[PDB]
């Protein structure tokens, strides 16, 4: 049939609806009202773990303190988007970046993401200082710029703590809030089951690529896994029966790869819709559901 035209069109359409899901999640930057916070201590609440550390020289960090601690616990292979074709020639076969250098011997490509790390550092900085007008009003159309320290005490008054307890225990509540943000950076271990899902997505991304490159060294019952050896040892009526085994074995691997990419693309599109509901309810508001 017209086999390769339909493999090309399926993966092109999968990569297109991957870009329309990221662009929808990031389109709240252009409409969100925001207030500026202070660098380090807002009232008595220490927010330094969540802020980007400012610098004198023009390096302009794109990573907060807790984000720089989470990214250096995950083992991701650098894909070399700029000049990765020549980096695979200066080094030999280092077998930890081997399915990164197998793009140029198997025949696939890892495409760069839609936004660089400076755009997604602007998405989470607008999530930290969103205005979100006052929490006794109906509607979503006014924006009340009350400080961070005062809007935490309105979230504690909403769950059933009176104003006479909140006024006598300001410092104790601030201390208990401060030593719960200092304990987030001791939870990036293999016992933490919510951190083990960050690594299991990295591993799932890499296991798909190694099942593509490993199906090219199988012989599938032929005399060799190489077409240039079948053409050199047999004659014209025996070559067609042995090449038809490699063809059948390699059409099965491509079908199994393309059929898994669509499953993972739909599952990641449904899960970026859950991240919008969890931002609009937990991050920008207060939840009334357990």
């Amino acid at each position: 049939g017209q086999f390769c035209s339909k493999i090309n069109q399926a993966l092109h359409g999968a990569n297109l609806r991957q870009d329309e899901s990221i662009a929808n999640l990031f389109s709240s930057i252009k409409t969100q009202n925001t207030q500026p916070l202070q660098a380090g201590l807002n009232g008595d609440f220490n927010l330094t773990m969540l802020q980007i550390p400012q610098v004198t020289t023009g390096e302009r960090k794109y990573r907060s303190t807790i984000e720089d601690l989470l990214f250096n616990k995950v083992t991701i292979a650098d894909p070399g988007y700029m000049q990765g074709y020549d980096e695979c020639m200066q080094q030999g076969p280092q077998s930890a970046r081997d399915l990164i250098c197998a793009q140029y011997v198997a025949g696939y490509k890892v495409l760069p993401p839609l936004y660089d790390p400076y755009m997604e550092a602007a998405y989470t900085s607008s999530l930290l200082g969103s205005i979100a007008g006052a929490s006794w009003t109906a509607g979503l159309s006014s924006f009340a710029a009350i400080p961070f320290a005062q809007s935490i005490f309105y979230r504690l008054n909403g769950v059933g703590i009176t104003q006479q307890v909140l006024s006598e225990n300001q410092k104790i509540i601030a201390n208990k809030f401060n030593q719960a943000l200092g304990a987030m950076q001791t939870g990036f271990t293999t016992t933490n089951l919510a951190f083990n899902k960050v690594q299991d997505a990295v591993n799932a991304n890499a296991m798909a690529l190694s099942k593509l490159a490993a199906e090219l060294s199988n012989t599938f019952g032929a005399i060799s896994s190489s077409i240039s050896d079948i053409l050199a040892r047999l004659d014209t009526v025996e070559q067609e029966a042995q090449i038809d085994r490699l063809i059948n074995g390699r059409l099965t691997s491509l079908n199994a790869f393309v059929a898994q990419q669509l499953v993972r693309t739909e599952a990641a599109a449904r899960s970026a819709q859950l991240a919008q509901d969890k931002v609009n309810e937990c991050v920008k508001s207060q939840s009334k559901r357990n």
């Binding site: 076969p93 081997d98 490509k109 760069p112 400076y118 009340a144 025996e238």
Partner: protein, 760 residues
């Protein structure tokens, strides 16, 4: 001069595929097609010298000494300037309506010189001649030997200038009385037609619009194609003639014509154009009427690679990754080691042993000449497994084993795989775990170093005594029989047994009548890491890598074969030196004989994406993950138009972005919010209106920050005006319900298919 290039959007020069007709589809085809925007070669004819009341000598060009090479076939564009005005080429100041003139061809296998004119362009054997005649109404094709005559300037001459044909249309093209043998007569004045094997005629209709004529050759003969076939109003060429010319045509020649019109009636004739055919891949679109409307040469540029890689003509603006459809003719890199000759001398001297006591020779680290060995015998059977007999004399192996014995080839069915009798049970069982061959030969009488025995012999029994009868001891594959020490005492008669108490064996002998016959079993072993049993070769310099570095070559290095590109690296040490492999067993590197290390890449390695904008119909190219200095060295994987733009170095040049090298782009300083052509890493492509693409950046704004005032209350932004906004959304609730008749789908109502489907 009047350039008329090939236009594939009208399907110019495309021969319709044989078989049936299609409608409302687009499909890919591999065949003989012209290049896109190829200029071809222009051939201009004219009228000869004419006076009032007189017809003088002919006016021609140097066309009858040009010998072009045929090599695939060609197509001819005829009469593209009909009904227009133009020069009568003999007098360029005279303007007349231009007419159509058909070409005449001479095609042959051998060429020489016209003696004693001593010029060039003489076809000397059977030659195929194609002539138009009858004022363009008839076409002769014949295949004769041309003998040059002996008259004044009739081609066997010291005064012969050039072959040139002519017509006198005031006599020949009188209306109703067309002389349909006039040009044939003018041809017969030049040559004698000796031993003509065929002669065919085809009838044309005189009309002047525009047409095409093609000619190719294969093992069914010479095929002629015409655009006049089945509709004159299109560009498609259809098959109308096959000529029985089975030898390979190498050369052709356009015969110069010069029409002897009267001087008062000087006409103009439209030049014709010849385009060569190439083995190309094309994309063809068939309309409702069945005619090919447009085509795409899939190796011309990157938009064509996009259209042929996704197999459609309308491509829907985007950024696409594409495949390669270019030919890029390869070279050769052969490098094997020198050793001594393998000695087959204990096979050609002495008496060949019996089958149960066969002889085995194992060769490693030598050069063999299997032709020299097999030339001494008369082969009557050559049966192989996982190798062919022809490839056995050209391969490089790690070991080579020959078992041989004497054996009469009337018992040839007892050595077959899985055979019945006592040959496979007690004498010899062949081993089929390696590639192997079985030769059965006769020793001719002139070969006198091979003595013959007196009796063929084989074992019929080998057993141990047991408490109940006999316990037979069968052969293992490739192994000797266990009764071999018991068989060395010899058998003087048929069914003569020998016993050592524990074992017992029985032999059968019968005399040798005629020549001696022998059996050879050859087994080879291919390995990696330097196959050392290699064939004998003559030496040649050219197979090296010092010159042809960054091109695709077909290599054969110490027994390892493949295709690839070799690049200069500086790398790996440790002592497996010769071949470096990946974790998926790819030849990633090679340690050469001189001193150098090379990186090995496949023949198509660099990734290519094309950015396409439909509203302006523009495109640009991105080589992802490649630095812009490697692109100008490896400019042979790419398309036909990318190679010339790379080699010219005269454009908006290659640009280094954060996602690879970019061709057709320009640095900009503009910042966009939405993006229709995203490149990755917050880069966007801006299509031209400018004349090239530009590169912009994605920066989202943010509404301005409301800062807290220092007072008792707070600030709140409250609306003072509003509108109503409408958001649209589609939710799918159902799909189309389909039931399949599985029996009719798979087997189509055939009972032989339906019994094979029960096994699943």
């Amino acid at each position: 001069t009047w350039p008329m290039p090939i236009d594939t959007s009208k399907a110019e020069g495309v021969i319709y595929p044989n078989g049936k007709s299609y409608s409302n589809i687009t499909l890919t085809y591999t065949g003989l097609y012209p290049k896109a925007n190829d200029l071809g070669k222009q051939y201009l004819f004219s009228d000869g010298h004419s006076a009032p009341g007189r017809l003088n000598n002919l006016f021609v060009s140097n066309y009858s000494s040009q010998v072009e090479s045929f090599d695939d076939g060609f197509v001819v564009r005829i009469g593209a300037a009909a009904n227009k005005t133009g020069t009568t080429v003999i007098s360029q100041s005279t303007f007349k309506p231009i007419k159509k003139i058909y070409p005449a061809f001479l095609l042959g296998h051998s060429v020489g010189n016209y003696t004693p004119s001593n010029r060039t362009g003489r076809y000397l054997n059977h030659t195929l001649v194609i002539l138009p005649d009858g004022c363009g109404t008839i076409l002769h094709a014949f295949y004769c030997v041309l003998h040059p005559r002996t008259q004044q300037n009739c081609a066997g001459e010291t005064n012969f200038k050039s072959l040139s044909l002519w017509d006198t249309p005031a006599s020949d093209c009188v209306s109703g009385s067309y002389n349909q043998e006039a040009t044939l007569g003018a041809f017969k004045v030049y040559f004698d037609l000796i031993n003509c094997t065929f002669r065919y005629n085809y009838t044309i209709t005189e009309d002047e619009n525009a047409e095409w004529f093609g000619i190719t050759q294969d093992t069914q003969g010479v095929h002629l194609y015409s655009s006049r076939k089945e509709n004159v109003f299109r560009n498609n060429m259809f098959h109308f003639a096959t000529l029985p010319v089975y030898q390979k045509i190498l050369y052709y020649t356009v015969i110069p014509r010069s029409i002897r019109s009267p001087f008062n009636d000087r006409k103009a004739w439209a030049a014709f154009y010849i385009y060569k055919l190439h083995p190309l891949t094309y994309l063809l679109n068939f309309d409702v009427e069945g005619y090919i409307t447009k085509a795409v040469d899939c190796g011309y540029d990157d938009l064509a690679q996009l259209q042929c890689s996704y197999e459609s003509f309308e491509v829907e603006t985007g950024v696409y990754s594409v495949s390669s459809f270019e030919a890029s003719p390869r070279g050769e890199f052969i490098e094997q080691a020198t050793t001594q000759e393998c000695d087959f001398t204990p096979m050609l001297t002495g008496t060949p042993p019996p089958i149960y006591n066969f002889k085995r020779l194992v060769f490693t680290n030598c050069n063999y000449n299997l032709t020299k060995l097999l030339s001494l015998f008369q082969v009557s059977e050559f049966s192989c497994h996982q190798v062919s007999p022809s490839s056995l004399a050209t391969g490089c192996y790690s070991s080579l084993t020959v078992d041989y014995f004497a054996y009469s080839t009337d018992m040839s069915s007892a050595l077959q795989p899985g055979a019945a009798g006592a040959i496979v049970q007690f004498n010899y069982k062949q081993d089929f775990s390696n590639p192997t061959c079985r030769v059965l030969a006769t020793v001719p009488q002139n070969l006198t170093t091979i003595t013959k025995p007196s009796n063929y012999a084989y074992l019929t029994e080998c057993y141990k005594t047991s408490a109940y009868g006999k316990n037979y001891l069968y052969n293992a594959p490739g192994a000797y029989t266990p009764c071999l020490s018991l068989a060395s005492r010899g058998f003087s008669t048929k069914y003569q047994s020998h016993s050592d108490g524990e074992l017992t064996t029985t032999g059968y002998i019968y005399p040798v009548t005629g020549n001696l016959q022998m059996a050879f079993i050859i087994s080879v072993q291919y390995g990696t890491d330097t196959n050392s049993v290699c064939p004998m070769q003559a030496l040649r310099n050219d197979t090296s890598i010092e010159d042809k570095l960054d091109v695709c070559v077909e290599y054969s290095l110490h027994g390892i074969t493949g295709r690839g590109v070799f690049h200069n690296c500086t790398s790996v040490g440790l002592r497996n030196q010769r071949f470096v492999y990946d974790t998926f067993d790819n030849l990633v590197g090679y340690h050469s004989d001189n001193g150098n290390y090379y990186c090995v890449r496949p023949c198509v390695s660099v990734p290519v994406s094309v950015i396409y904008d439909k509203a302006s119909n523009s495109h640009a190219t991105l080589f992802g993950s490649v630095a812009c200095s490697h692109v100008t060295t490896m400019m042979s994987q790419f398309s036909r138009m990318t190679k010339t733009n790379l080699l010219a170095r005269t454009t908006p040049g290659p640009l280094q972005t954060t996602v690879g090298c970019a061709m057709g782009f320009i640095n900009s300083s503009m910042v966009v919010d939405e993006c229709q052509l995203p490149l990755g890493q917050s880069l966007c492509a801006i299509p031209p209106t400018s004349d090239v693409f530009q590169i912009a950046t994605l920066n989202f704004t943010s509404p301005l920050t409301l800062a807290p005032i220092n007072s008792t209350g707070f600030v709140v932004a409250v609306p003072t005006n509003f509108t109503f906004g409408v958001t649209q959304e589609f939710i799918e609730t159902t799909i189309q319900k389909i039931t399949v008749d599985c029996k009719q789908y798979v087997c189509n109502g055939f009972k032989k298919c339906e019994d094979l489907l029960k096994e699943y």
